[PDB]
Design an enzyme around this catalytic site. Structure first.
Site, PDB file in Angstrom:
ATOM      1  N   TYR A 136       0.816  -1.212   0.000  1.00 41.26           N
ATOM      2  CA  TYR A 136       0.000   0.000   0.000  1.00 41.26           C
ATOM      3  C   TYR A 136       0.849   1.261   0.000  1.00 41.26           C
ATOM      4  CZ  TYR A 136      -4.266  -2.616   1.262  1.00 41.26           C
ATOM      5  OH  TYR A 136      -5.346  -3.473   1.297  1.00 41.26           O
ATOM      6  N   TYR A 157      -1.530  -9.722   1.008  1.00 38.92           N
ATOM      7  CA  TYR A 157      -0.495  -9.200   1.846  1.00 38.92           C
ATOM      8  C   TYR A 157      -0.617  -9.600   3.277  1.00 38.92           C
ATOM      9  CZ  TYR A 157      -3.815  -5.780   2.877  1.00 38.92           C
ATOM     10  OH  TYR A 157      -4.945  -5.149   3.228  1.00 38.92           O
ATOM     11  N   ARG A 166      -4.038 -11.382   3.885  1.00 39.51           N
ATOM     12  CA  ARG A 166      -5.297 -11.003   3.249  1.00 39.51           C
ATOM     13  C   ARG A 166      -5.344 -11.584   1.836  1.00 39.51           C
ATOM     14  NH1 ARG A 166      -8.399  -7.331   4.135  1.00 39.51           N
ATOM     15  NH2 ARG A 166      -9.759  -9.165   3.873  1.00 39.51           N
ATOM     16  N   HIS A 175      -7.596  -8.054  -2.616  1.00 43.15           N
ATOM     17  CA  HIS A 175      -8.888  -7.371  -2.400  1.00 43.15           C
ATOM     18  C   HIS A 175      -8.817  -5.894  -2.736  1.00 43.15           C
ATOM     19  CE1 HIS A 175      -6.688  -6.526   1.335  1.00 43.15           C
ATOM     20  NE2 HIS A 175      -7.429  -5.436   1.399  1.00 43.15           N
ATOM     21  N   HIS A 185     -10.780  -2.342  -1.571  1.00 43.77           N
ATOM     22  CA  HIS A 185     -11.699  -1.695  -0.634  1.00 43.77           C
ATOM     23  C   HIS A 185     -12.687  -0.823  -1.412  1.00 43.77           C
ATOM     24  CE1 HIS A 185      -9.359  -2.645   3.076  1.00 43.77           C
ATOM     25  NE2 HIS A 185      -8.346  -2.666   2.226  1.00 43.77           N
TER      26      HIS A 185
HETATM   27 FE   LIG Z   1      -6.634  -3.849   2.588  1.00 39.54          FE
END
Ligand SMILES: [Fe+3]
Ligand SMILES: [Fe+3]
Ligand SMILES: [Fe+3]
Ligand SMILES: [Fe+3]
EC number: 1.13.11.3
Lengths: 238, 200, 238, 200, 238, 200, 200
Positions: free
Chosen positions: A108, A147, A157, A160, A162
Site C-alpha cells: 500500500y 499481503y 489477506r 482485495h 476496498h
Molecule cells: Fe486492505
C-alpha cells in the site's frame, strides 16, 4: 434542500459481520459491549449527500493513468465494473463509488505500511466514480496482491479492493471489500470470516467477466453492490 | 415471508482507509476536489464552530486511525444534499484522527432544529458514522451540544436511550480552541463511559 | 411439613436459553458473567409450595369472562389446554399454572405498555388454574396479537402467551412462553432464538387442536409442558 | 445413553410479568386470594423481620421490573408446603421491585436451621428465584444474614463458593426500620460485586 | 367507446376450482350439470369498465379509519399490499381492487352473520382502491379471525380477506380469497380445497412482508394477483 | 410448451359478498359513490327498460344471496368503458337478489346490435356474471330479448348452443311494470331448464 | 395440528346383514335373547304406537334388504340405556325391511320432549340409522310426527335444515294399521323427495 420522503429496509446485522469477531484481533477492543439503540427513521437518517456536482478529474476512475510518473504500473490489467442496485432491484444512479487497494505485490502507498514488497512508481491505488443513469460504474486498475498482516503468526489477506458506496442516504452508506473468484486465501481470512454466513461471503466475490474484457489488453471482473431497499412512506401519523 | 435481495455485507475500512478517503493523511497528493472537514465557507449563515474529539478503545487507548463522516442540518435547519465545494455550506463532511495526537477536527456551523417524522423537534445534532481498523460495520452516533440542555431534555431521540447516564455520552462539551468557540466530542467505543451507538 | 425424599434430573442449560444472548438486547446487561455455582440438592431445593388450597375464583381460568365490563372481548376465541408431566412421563397433578398475554391487537393491560393499539374494555389478559388429578389444565381466552418492541428497529414478538408452572419443588418451577403453530414471526424473534437448539424451540409451539374445539364457538390449541424428572433418593450417605 | 423427555425450555418473564404474577404492580385489580409478600401473620412464632433490597444490572442501574419468588423454612427449620392464606405462616412468597424506587420488600420470620442431605447444618437462609425482562432463565440465589456470621462460616453451601470474597455477596445487612429488625439484600446481576447464583 | 383489439389467454378450469366440489356443501345444488358452452371472444367479452373516474373517499382503502365511531378497531394492525399483473407479467394499472372481511374475532358486519363473537364498533370490514400506474395496490386493516360455519360439524374458515379485481375486461374479472402464511386451518378448509391443485392453493397465500411494515405500528402482508394474459389480435379474418 | 404465469385461482364470493360489493344489502352505510343497478339516467338515449329476475338452485329453491354484474352496449351498439356516475349512461352495473323475495332489478336501456369478431351481427344482449355462496367460479351468461326473435334466430353466439331448446333459456320475457317496458330473466343454475353458461 | 388415532373406516353391511343382526329374517334360528323391534312391553307408560315405512333408492325402487337401528326417549323424555329384554321400555331397537313388501315395523311409544345442549326443547323424535348393501357408511335421520306441528315448527334441529320443503321429509304421517295408531315414515335415499340425512 433534502426532504424526508422514503424509508430504508432495516439491516440484517446477522448478515453483516458482528462487531465482536475475536479471530480478527483488533475487533476485540474496538467493538461496543452495549447493545445498539434502535431509533426510528427521520430526515436525519433518510437523507444524505448527492455527489453529482463534485468535480471529477478525467482519470479519477483509471488507476493505470491517475498516478502517472513516466510509465504504466506493473501488474494484471483489469477492469472492475458492476451495478449498484437496492434490495428491490432498483438501480442507484449518480451515486459515489470510491475504491482503494495495494499494488500488484500487496504493498500500500500509505506511510504506515512497512511491508517489504516494493512500491510501484506508477501506481497510487485510489479511484472514484459516479454510477451512471442506469446504476453502472467502472474502474481500470491492476489486480492487487495478497499481503501479510500482524494478526495471527501467518495471516495473509486475499487479494482485495476496498469499496465505499454512498447511496441515497446516510442509512445506505457502506464500506466493504471485493475479493476475486477462486482465491484460495478467502476461506482462511479472519476478516472475511467476520461474516458468519457463507452465502454473505459469496456476495463479496467478484467474478471473472470475459465478456467485458479488452482483448490483447485487459481482463475484467464484475462486482455488483446491493444497498438497502428504499420505499415510499405509507400510513404514517394516522 | 418476503425476502428481498440481501444487502452487500460490510467489512472493515482497515488501517489504510486514508488512501481512498483521506488522501493528505495517507501522505499522498490530493486531487483537485476532495470531500473534507470544512463544511462552511467563512460567510455561511449561522454560528461558526469548531468540533474536535478523540476516539478510545476498550483499553482506554487512542484509536489513531479513525475515519469519520458527518451529516448535519445548516443553521436554518435545512439539509444541504447537493454537495459542491462552491457551496456556502455543505451538510456532509469527512475527517480522520491525526496519527500522533489521535485528534479529529471539523469546521462547521451549529445546526438548526429539525423535526422527527412525527413532527416533534429534535435537539440540535450532528449525525456521525465512525469507521476504522477493527470496526467491521461502521458505528452510528449523534453529537448534541451541552448549551442546548432544554432542547436535549425534550429530544425524542435522546429519550429513546433508557438510562440518563448513557444520554450524557452524546453531549459535546463547549470549550475554546485558539480563542474560538468549539465543542469537544470524545467517543469511547467500549467499556466505561461507552458512547451510545444507534441502529436505524 | 415437607420432606427431602426426591431428586430432580439436572437441567440441560444448553437446551434452555443461555443467559447471554446478545440479539435479545436486554440480556446483555442482565446476564451473570461468573459461572453458576453448582450445589447438591437438599430439602431447600427439592421442596416447594403446593397450591391445592389456594382459593380460585370461578372465572380465574376464563379470560373471556374474568374482565367483564359489559361484553365479550374482541378476538379469536380459543381454548388453550394441555398436560403437565415430568421427564419420566409422570403426570404432575394439582400444580399451579398461571398465564398472561396481550389482547387481540397486541396491547397489554400494563401501565408501561404504550403501544398505539387500543385496550379492549372486556379483556384483562390474566389466567390461573390448578392441573387436575391427571395433570391436565385448561384456559379459555382470545388469541393474542403480535406486538412490536424496542429491540432491533423492526422487531415483533410472535403471538404468544406467557406461562408460569410451579411443579413439585422450587427446582421444577418454570416460566416460559407459548407460540402458535405456523406463525411466520417465530423464526425471526430474538427471544425465541435465545434458545440455541431448533428442536427446543419446537417444544414451545402449541398445536391447533380441532378435536378440542367447540363447534360454532371456539377453536383450541394444545400445549404440553415437561418439568424436570423426579426420582426417589437412592444409596445416599452409605 | 438414556435420554428422557426434554424439559420445556425457559423464556424471559418479560416486562409485563406483573399482570400475571403481581397484579397490583401492573396497575390492575386483584383477585380474592393472591400469593404475595407477607409470609408471616403477626401471630406466627419466631423473630419477625422485614427484608428489602434493590436489583442492579451490569451497568450499575436499577432493575425496576424484577419479580422475585422466595422459599424459606419456618422458625423451627421446617418447610411448610401447604400454601394457605389462612395460615399464620407460609414458606413461599412473591415480591417485585417498585418501578419508581426499584425496591422490593418481604414480611416474614427468620428461618431456622436446616441440614443438608449429608446431615450438616446450613446457616439460616432464604432461597430466592429472580425473573425479569432480559433474564432468559431465572437466577437462583440465597439470602443469608450478617447476624449469623459464625453459622455462615460453617455453612456447607457457602463453603462450595471457592472464593471467600464471593460469599460476602450473599450476606444481608441488618438494620432497624421503624423500630423493627430488617435486613437489606441487594442483588448485582453482573460485574463488580456480582451476586453468587446457583445451579441445582 | 371501447374497441375489440385484444384477446385473453383461455382459462384453465382445472387450475381454478371446478363447479362441483361436494365437500363444500352449498356447491352441490349451485353447480351447473351441463357443460359450459365455449364462445369466441368478441367485443362483448374483451372490453370492460375502467374505474379511473370513480370517486374514492379519502379512507376507502383504510379499514382502520373508514368505520370510525370514536376509536381504533381492536386487532392485529396490518398493511395488505401487492401488484396486479397479467399472465405475461405486464402490470395492470388503474384497476379496481375491492375487499371485504370479518373483524379480529371472525364476526362479519352483515345482517345474516349470527356468530356469537362480538362486532367491533370501530370496524366495518370493507375497502377499495385503484391500482397505481405500476399495478400496485395497498390497504390498511386488521387481520381477520377464523370463523366457524355450517358446512361439516366442526368446520372453520382460515383467516381470510375476500378480493374482487376488475382488470381490463369482463373476461379478466375475478373474485378470490387471500389466506395468511402458515395458517394451519388452510389445508383443512373445503373452500380452499375446492382448488384441486396444491400449487394453485399456494397462489392464494399472502406472505408476511417485514420490509413493508411500519415499525412500532403495523405489520404487512404481500398478495400479488395474476389476471388472464392479454395480447393483440393477430391474423384474424384472413 | 410455453407456460405463462398461472392465473390467480377463483374462490366463492361467499354469503357476505354484499358487505364489499352491495353495501345497502348487507344492512350497511354507503359511500358517496357506489357502483349499482341504474345504468341509465332518465336522459340517456334509447328505449328505457326495467330488467328483473330470480335465481334458482338445483332443487328449485331461490338463491337469496346472488350477486350479479352486467355489461352491455348503449343504444348505438357501442360499449362505454369510461365509468362515471355523472354519465347519462354506463355500460356496467351491479345488482343482487333480495334476501326476502329473491328478486334483482336493473334500470337501463335496450342495447343496440354489436358484431362478433367475424363481422356477423349478434342479437341485442346483456352480458351477465353471477356470483354467490356455493359458486366457486362465477357463471357467465347472456340475457337476450323475446321481442327480438328474428335477430335471435340468426345470432352467431346463440347458434353455438347445439340444441334449440337450450337457447330458449337465454330469452327474457317482455312485460309491463307500472306502465314501463320490463323483461324477466330468471336463471336456473342446475337441472330442469338449466340456463346456458359460457366459457370464453 | 393434533392428530388422534384414526377411526376404523366404515364398510357396507352387505345384503346378508340379517345373518348377524336380524336372524329370523335371514331364515335362521334365533338365540335366547335378541335385540329387535318391540321397544315397549304392553304396560309401558305412554301412548303405544306402531311405526312403519319403506325405503326407496334413486330409481324409486324398494330397498328390500334395509337394516335400521332406532334410539328414542321414553314417554317421560328419558333415554333408557340399560338395555334389557325385561325392561318395560327400551330406548333402543332394531328392524329390517321384509324382502317381499320391503316394509319395516317397530312397536314403541311416542317419545317425550328432550332439550338440546343449549336447553331448547326438541320436538318429539326417533333417531334412525340406516344400513344396507350399497350404503358404505350408515345414514342418520330423525322421524318426527305430523301431529306435533307446533313443536316441529320450533325444533332447533329441524330449523337447521335451510329449506322448509326438506324439513317435510322428516315428518311421519299419522295413520291406522289394523285399527291402531301408527305413523308411516318412508325414506327416499336419493332424488325426488330425498330424505334429510344428518352428520354429527
Ligand atoms: Fe486492505
Ligand atoms: Fe409478551
Ligand atoms: Fe368469508
Ligand atoms: Fe360379506
Amino acid at each position: 434542500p433534502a426532504q424526508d420522503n422514503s424509508r430504508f429496509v432495516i439491516r440484517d446485522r446477522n448478515w453483516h459481520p458482528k462487531a465482536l469477531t475475536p479471530d480478527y484481533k483488533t475487533s476485540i477492543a474496538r467493538s461496543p459491549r452495549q447493545a445498539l439503540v434502535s431509533i426510528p427513521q427521520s430526515i436525519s437518517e433518510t437523507t444524505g449527500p448527492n455527489f453529482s456536482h463534485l468535480g471529477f478529474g478525467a482519470h479519477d476512475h483509471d488507476l493505470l493513468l491517475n498516478f502517472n510518473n513516466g510509465g504504466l504500473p506493473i501488474g494484471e490489467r483489469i477492469i472492475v465494473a458492476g451495478r449498484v442496485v437496492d434490495q428491490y432491484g432498483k438501480p442507484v444512479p449518480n451515486t459515489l463509488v470510491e475504491m482503494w487497494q495495494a499494488n500488484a505485490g500487496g504493498r500500500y502507498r500509505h506511510k504506515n505500511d512497512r511491508y517489504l514488497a516494493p512500491l510501484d512508481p506508477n501506481f497510487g491505488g485510489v479511484g472514484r466514480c459516479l454510477t451512471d443513469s442506469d446504476g453502472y460504474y467502472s474502474f481500470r486498475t491492476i489486480k492487487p496482491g495478497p499481503y501479510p498482516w500482524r494478526n495471527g503468526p501467518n495471516d495473509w489477506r486475499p487479494a482485495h479492493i476496498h469499496f465505499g458506496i454512498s447511496g441515497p442516504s446516510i442509512a445506505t452508506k457502506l464500506i466493504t471489500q471485493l475479493y476475486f473468484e477462486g482465491d484460495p486465501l478467502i476461506p482462511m481470512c479472519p476478516i472475511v470470516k467476520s461474516i458468519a454466513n457463507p452465502e454473505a461471503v459469496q456476495q463479496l466475490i467478484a467474478k471473472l467477466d470475459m465478456n467485458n474484457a479488452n482483448p490483447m489488453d485487459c481482463l475484467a471482473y464484475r462486482f455488483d453492490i446491493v444497498l438497502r431497499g428504499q420505499r415510499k412512506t405509507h400510513f404514517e401519523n394516522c | 415471508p418476503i425476502e428481498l435481495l440481501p444487502e452487500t455485507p460490510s467489512q472493515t475500512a482497515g488501517p489504510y482507509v486514508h488512501i481512498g478517503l483521506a488522501l493528505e493523511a495517507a501522505g499522498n497528493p490530493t486531487r483537485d476536489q476532495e470531500i473534507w472537514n470544512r463544511l462552511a465557507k467563512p460567510d455561511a449563515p449561522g454560528e461558526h464552530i469548531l468540533l474536535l474529539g478523540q476516539v478510545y478503545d476498550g483499553n482506554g487507548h487512542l484509536v489513531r486511525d479513525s475515519f469519520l463522516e458527518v451529516w448535519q442540518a445548516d443553521a436554518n435547519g435545512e439539509y444541504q444534499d447537493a454537495y459542491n465545494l462552491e457551496n456556502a455550506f455543505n451538510s456532509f463532511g469527512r475527517t480522520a484522527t491525526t496519527f500522533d495526537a489521535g485528534e479529529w477536527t471539523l469546521h462547521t456551523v451549529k445546526p438548526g432544529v429539525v423535526n422527527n417524522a412525527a413532527g416533534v423537534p429534535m435537539a440540535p445534532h450532528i449525525n456521525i458514522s465512525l469507521f476504522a481498523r477493527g470496526i467491521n460495520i461502521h458505528l452510528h452516533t449523534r453529537l448534541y451540544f451541552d448549551d442546548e440542555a432544554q432542547a436535549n431534555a425534550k429530544c425524542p431521540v435522546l429519550n429513546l436511550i433508557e438510562q440518563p447516564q448513557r444520554r450524557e455520552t452524546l453531549i459535546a462539551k463547549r470549550c475554546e480552541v485558539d480563542g474560538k468557540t468549539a465543542y469537544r466530542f470524545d467517543i469511547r467505543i467500549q467499556g466505561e463511559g461507552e458512547t451510545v451507538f444507534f441502529d436505524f
